[PDB]
Design a protein around this ligand. Structure first.
Ligand SMILES: [Zn+2]
Ligand SMILES: [Zn+2]
Ligand SMILES: [Zn+2]
Ligand SMILES: [Zn+2]
Lengths: 56, 56
C-alpha cells in the first residue's frame, strides 16, 4: 500500500531514530517532516535521517 | 516474505549506505554482515549502519 500521507508514492522513506526506523511514508513526505523538525509520526522520536529504502 | 538469508525473521534489517538502504535481510543477519566487514549483498556498497525497520 502507498505512503499513508500522500497515498501516491510507495512506502520508501524510512524515518530513522537511533537504531530503529519507521517505514510508513515515502521519501518525499518523510523528508518534509524532517525539514519541518517534526518527530516520527508513529512513535514521536526526533528524526535523525530519512533513508530511501528499496525492498530488494 | 522473510529474510532471504535465514528465511525465519522479517525483512527488518535495513542496510544503510549514504541516503539509501537495501532491505532484504533481518536485523540479526544484516548485523552479522556489518560486524564481518561485508558490503551490501545487493549493491556492494560499504554498510554504514543497520536500522531495525518497522513496516507500518
Ligand atoms: Zn508520501
Ligand atoms: Zn518512529
Ligand atoms: Zn535473517
Ligand atoms: Zn545496498
Amino acid at each position: 500500500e502507498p505512503c499513508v500521507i500522500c497515498q501516491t508514492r510507495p512506502k520508501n522513506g524510512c524515518i530513522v531514530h537511533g537504531r530503529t526506523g519507521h517505514l510508513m511514508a515515502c521519501y518525499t513526505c518523510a523528508k518534509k517532516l524532517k525539514k519541518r523538525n517534526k518527530p516520527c509520526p508513529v512513535c514521536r522520536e526526533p528524526i535523525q535521517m530519512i533513508v530511501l529504502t528499496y525492498f530488494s
